[PDB]
Nucleic acid binder design. Structure first.
Ligand SMILES: [Ba+2]
Ligand SMILES: [Ba+2]
Ligand SMILES: [Ba+2]
Ligand SMILES: [Ba+2]
Ligand SMILES: [Ba+2]
Ligand SMILES: [Ba+2]
Ligand SMILES: [Ba+2]
Ligand SMILES: [Ba+2]
Ligand SMILES: [Ba+2]
Ligand SMILES: [Ba+2]
Ligand SMILES: [Mg+2]
Length: 1030
RNA sequence: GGUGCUAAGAUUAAUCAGGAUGUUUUUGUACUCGAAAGAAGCUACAAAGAUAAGGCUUCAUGCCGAAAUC
DNA sequence: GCTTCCTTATCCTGATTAATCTTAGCAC
DNA sequence: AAGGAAGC
């Protein structure tokens, strides 16, 4: 308490409120808001989804390149330039089963099998070819109306079936005597069915990649998840200990016993007493929780024992050396023949590894050569799987090293682990967040520490540092209610396991074979029991015999899709048949159920849902929302990440204010107090503005010095307050973010509307005209300009003689879909033809927008440019032209940077940079001022009037409009629309988006940089040339 | 109040292994025109190619590219 | 040139490590 | 949300 200043922090996923106040005077010395959108770090799910998607399409292509190399070595084909892409590979995969195929014809049968090699956890070619013949289609997720009923097929088969089929084809071809060796057949089946292990990942011995096993340092890990194991609580360079290890079992039971309270001289047990119990249970075969307590009664009365962990339902529980007991059951070994650190090691190998090929490898590379026999590793493999429930329990918070120190002291001194430990006895934000793999938390952590390191730097050491926390303080009636639910959840788990075992065996438990390769049944079963054994989309029943023995037929569907909601809870989850899940797509049951070919009706869903008591409240809300959710609309992931980030700063601070003897108090406030206090104090929260972070932090810094005020509150409601608040934003300099919309667009030459000659038009298509979203789109184009539909122009027969007659004679009514009302009656609208022929009509392409700025991705094949659109920007280089006295803004995009051919570096070249300079309006003899990145700050001053406004940058918008820029407000997230600006800029557009051009005659622009606290300083001296150092 | 060991309930994150699509190019068949040859490139199915722009070297269970670093 | 408007690809299967909150027992 | 052509 050497100083008098108090610091408070309101740490979020996308903001950090800052606030300093004198605990004595009550003055507000500093209020500040640091803003870094969490949206960028949360995009990591998009990065991982696209990285794994890239690896799958890469390996699917490689599988057919290896096949091309196989056909050269075997000498079956040498010139691949004349292979025909127009035969029937499904028919060739049936002819080859009995009759002989050409080498070319065989290459077509195997390549087709390699491109779709099925899942892996009548041959397929015969099942497929027959779907081709009777339905006209194989691929994907489509509907069939057989036996007078609507059913749904998908092109999914097991890789064992494809392998079986492939092997039959190739042997039948061996009977016809070519270069089909037996090594040819083996190598092909490896291409077809070969797969990597989840614990090895990508690469080989030469392709070193730190995502996978073959590390770039040279190490070759046995398992890529071993390095992800947590570290010791107290020896941070010691890996944790398996909970099935001997050491962790020993430590846990001792700390269990020392916590007991028994009728003895010291009310606790003795060193000699511990040893007998440790020794008794180690040597007794069956050991439960209460059977151990009966043994404690002999060494004394069971109801006289106190101080023990309890079950959710009130049963007592205790450690049992269970792992150890079940290990003595090994016949080809004996745990008694092994010491501690080879028994501890056996739990490390059997816990991290879950499959045969992984256990066998770790036993060789961690245990000395010849320490295990092929007969002994056999039993251990079968032993690991037979007791996955015990080895799937994880890792102790302590390393072995720590317990080896804390175990003898646990025997002798009779104190529990915490008592023992005490007796024994500028923050680097990057080091604190080195091994925290959560870019949201790690960012919002690194930001909060970068502030105190900069607040101390300019305010000296603080008296106190307060941090709002997201915890609870439930009362006795409230704390009782929580465990009431927690028990009811664990009960309905086992209620479903019981319900499952009664209907599968009739017995009380389920065989452990049943959970191999299906670790998710205990949750699939819990949903099968909530839904009353019913599929909530088809209405068909779910039999645990199919749910267990043919679980391919089911998928766990997110009710409200994950792409929109990001709700990963149980309430957003149902167990339904697979084909029903795929037909649903990215929809809610409301949007989807009625328009599904195979399914219930929304009405029958509404019926079943509120006619059941086993379902949940939150699950009933989510199953029936008639709400048109979408992702472009004004989550639990945000609450977990806040608690995480806040706690890391709290712990890291108190630990820092100890070993460095700075001795600054580090206190804590809760959310219920600061929100109540906010009402009591003067808290008028401004609308949608970043002010409330800086003021919340001041309440945080004030709720501490509370015991010791009116001046401060008076000051808080001051007129001149929301004006003095400072704001600071984290600039985004990164290149190589998402470069464009993923949609691959086609273009055509046409004349539309007020057009004189040909013009390159980007196409759009209406994916489905039998939906109210697909019909609406049709009418919009139809009223505006019928000819936009490529059909009208290139097939007027179908338009004038099929579509217009349908538009006239069909209900249109609440609005309804005319095309759908035809589908129910006559089926899919068919293209015009004579003999009743003509294919179905499901989609309609039209001419939509003219081609403008794009990225070209046009095949060498194409008769038309194929392009990418909405090209995301990187930075803007601001120049000044002394002649005209105007500014000249050059815009760079993510897609202007490239990996260079020769060198391989990711960069942009002066040649390309100068070509962009040219077309952007920047004169080759103009002076560079500064570069603007995302969320840099501008100052824009009128020179005619000297009126000025502070903006923050978004990007350089509109390439046709030179020197145009989209800007964003200094104090809030976005503009309202119609907001007024300096005279020369006018008002913002009534949509919010402030898109103005900064190339006018008398305007002066200056770059503004700020620290993490909001200390602004002007810039114009950034350099001679722009920075392009890569 | 903070914190530790344990256990469970709830919710998340990081990373790996795979499936089936979707987008688009080309080709073939069907549909429309033509006596055919073919034309058209609409509409449907199928195959083949591309699939963030783009790069790597070690020639393959090949590797990297939408995060972080400010 | 300036402002208004339209638009934007997904559903799953298997596995491991880690984190936070909460309730319980014990302790500093 | 923000890229960027449409619409005037
Ligand atoms: Ba586990
Ligand atoms: Ba309360
Ligand atoms: Ba569309
Ligand atoms: Ba976009
Ligand atoms: Ba506590
Ligand atoms: Ba042609
Ligand atoms: Ba394809
Ligand atoms: Ba590529
Ligand atoms: Ba114009
Ligand atoms: Ba557009
Ligand atoms: Mg779904």
């Amino acid at each position: 308490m050497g100083s008098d200043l108090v610091l408070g922090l309101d740490i979020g996923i996308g903001s950090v409120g800052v606030g300093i106040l004198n605990k004595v005077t009550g003055e507000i010395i500093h209020k500040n808001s640091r803003i870094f959108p969490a949206a960028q770090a949360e995009n990591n799910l998009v990065r991982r989804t696209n990285r794994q998607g890239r690896r799958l399409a890469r390996r699917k292509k490689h599988r057919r390149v290896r096949l091309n190399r196989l056909f050269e070595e075997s000498g079956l084909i040498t010139d691949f330039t004349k292979i025909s892409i127009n035969l029937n590979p499904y028919q060739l995969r049936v002819k080859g089963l009995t009759d002989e195929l050409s080498n070319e014809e065989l290459f077509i049968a195997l390549k087709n099998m390699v491109k779709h090699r099925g899942i892996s956890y009548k041959t397929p070619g015969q099942i497929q070819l027959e779907r081709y013949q009777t339905y006209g289609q194989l691929r994907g997720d489509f509907t069939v109306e057989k036996d007078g009923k609507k059913h749904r097929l998908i092109n999914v088969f097991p890789t064992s079936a494809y392998r079986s089929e492939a092997l039959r084809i190739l042997q039948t071809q061996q009977e016809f005597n070519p270069q089909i060796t037996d090594e040819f057949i083996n190598r092909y089946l490896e291409i077809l069915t070969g797969k990597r292990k989840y614990y090895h990942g990508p690469g080989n011995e030469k392709s070193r990649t730190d995502y996978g096993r073959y590390r770039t340092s040279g190490e070759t890990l046995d398992n890529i998840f071993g390095i992800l194991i947590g570290k010791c609580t107290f020896y941070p360079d010691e890996f944790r200990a398996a909970k099935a290890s001997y050491t962790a079992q020993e430590f846990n039971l001792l700390n269990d016993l020392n916590n007991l309270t028994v009728p003895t001289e010291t009310k606790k047990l003795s060193k000699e007493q511990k040893n007998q119990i440790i020794n008794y249970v180690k040597n007794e075969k069956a050991m439960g929780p209460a059977k151990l307590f009966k043994y404690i009664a002999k060494l004394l009365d069971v109801a006289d024992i106190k101080g023990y962990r309890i079950d959710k339902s009130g049963k007592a529980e205790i450690h049992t050396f269970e792992a150890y007991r079940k290990m003595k059951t090994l016949e080809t070994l004996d745990i008694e023949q092994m010491d501690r650190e080879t028994l501890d090691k056996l739990a490390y190998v059997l816990t991290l590894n879950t499959e045969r090929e992984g256990i066998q490898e770790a036993l060789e590379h961690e245990f000395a050569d010849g320490s295990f026999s092929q007969k002994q590793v056999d039993e251990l493999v079968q032993f690991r799987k037979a007791n996955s429930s015990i080895f799937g329990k994880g890792w102790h918070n302590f390393s072995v090293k720590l317990m080896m120190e804390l175990i003898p002291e646990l025997y002798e001194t009779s104190e529990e682990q915490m008592t023992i430990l005490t007796r024994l006895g500028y923050i680097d934000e990057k080091l604190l967040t080195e091994e925290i793999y959560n870019p949201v938390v790690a960012k919002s952590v690194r930001q909060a520490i970068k502030i105190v390191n900069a607040a101390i730097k300019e305010y000296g050491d603080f008296d106190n540092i307060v941090i709002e926390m997201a915890r609870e303080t439930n009362e006795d009636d409230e704390k009782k209610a929580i465990q009431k639910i927690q028990k009811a959840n664990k009960d309905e788990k086992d209620a479903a396991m019981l319900k499952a075992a009664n209907q599968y065996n009739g017995k009380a438990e389920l065989p452990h074979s049943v959970f191999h390769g299906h670790k998710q049944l205990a949750t699939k079963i819990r949903l099968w029991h909530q839904q009353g054994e019913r599929c909530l989309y088809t209405g068909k029943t779910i039999s645990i015999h199919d749910l267990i023995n043919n679980s391919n037929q089911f998928e766990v569907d997110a009710i409200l899709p994950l792409s929109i909601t990001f709700d990963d809870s149980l309430a957003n989850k149902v167990l339904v048949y697979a084909t029903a899940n795929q037909e649903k797509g990215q929809r809610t049951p409301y949007q989807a159920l009625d328009s599904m070919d195979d399914a219930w009706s929304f009405r029958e869903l509404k019926a079943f849902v509120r006619e059941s008591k086993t379902l949940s409240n939150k699950k009933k809300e989510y199953l029936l929302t008639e709400e048109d959710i979408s992702k472009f609309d004004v989550i639990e992931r945000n609450l977990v990440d806040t608690r995480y980030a806040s706690r890391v700063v709290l712990n890291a601070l108190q630990e820092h204010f100890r070993a460095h003897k700075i001795d600054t108090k580090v206190s804590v406030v809760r959310g219920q107090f600061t929100s109540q206090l906010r009402r009591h104090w003067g808290i008028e929260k401004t609308r949608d503005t970043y002010h409330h972070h800086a003021v919340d932090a001041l309440i945080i810094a004030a709720s501490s010095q509370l015991n010791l005020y009116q001046h401060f509150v008076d000051t808080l409601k001051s007129k001149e307050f929301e004006d003095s608040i400072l704001f600071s934003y984290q600039v985004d300099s990164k290149f190589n973010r998402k470069i464009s919309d993923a949609t691959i667009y086609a273009t055509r030459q046409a004349k539309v509307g007020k057009d004189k000659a040909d013009e390159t038009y980007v196409l759009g298509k209406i994916k489905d005209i039998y939906t109210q979203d697909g019909y609406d789109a049709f009418m919009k184009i139809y009223k505006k300009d019928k000819s936009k539909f490529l059909m009208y122009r290139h097939d007027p027969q179908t338009f004038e003689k099929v579509i217009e007659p349908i538009l006239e004679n069909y209900p249109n009514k609440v609005p309804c879909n005319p095309f759908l009302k035809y589908k129910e009656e006559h089926g899919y609208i068919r293209k015009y033809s004579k003999k009743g022929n003509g294919p179905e009509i499901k989609s309609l392409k039209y001419y939509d927008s003219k081609l403008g700025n794009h990225i070209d991705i046009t095949p060498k094949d194409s008769n038309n440019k194929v392009v990418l659109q909405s090209v995301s920007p990187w930075r803007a280089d601001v120049y000044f032209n002394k002649t005209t006295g105007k500014y000249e803004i050059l815009g760079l995009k993510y897609a202007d940077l490239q990996f260079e051919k020769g060198t391989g570096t990711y960069k942009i070249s002066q040649e390309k940079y100068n070509d962009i300079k040219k077309k952007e309006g920047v004169d080759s003899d103009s002076e560079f001022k500064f570069t603007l990145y995302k969320n840099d700050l501008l100052l824009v001053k009128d020179t005619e009037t000297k009126e000025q406004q502070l903006f923050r940058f978004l990007s350089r918008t509109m390439p046709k409009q030179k020197h145009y820029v989209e800007l964003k407000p200094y104090d809030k997230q976005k503009f309202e629309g119609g907001e007024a600006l300096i005279k020369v800029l006018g008002n913002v557009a009534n949509s919010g988006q402030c898109k103005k051009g900064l190339g006018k005659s008398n305007i002066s622009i200056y770059k503004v940089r700020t620290d993490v606290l909001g200390n602004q300083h002007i810039i114009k001296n950034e350099g001679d040339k722009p920075k392009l150092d890569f």
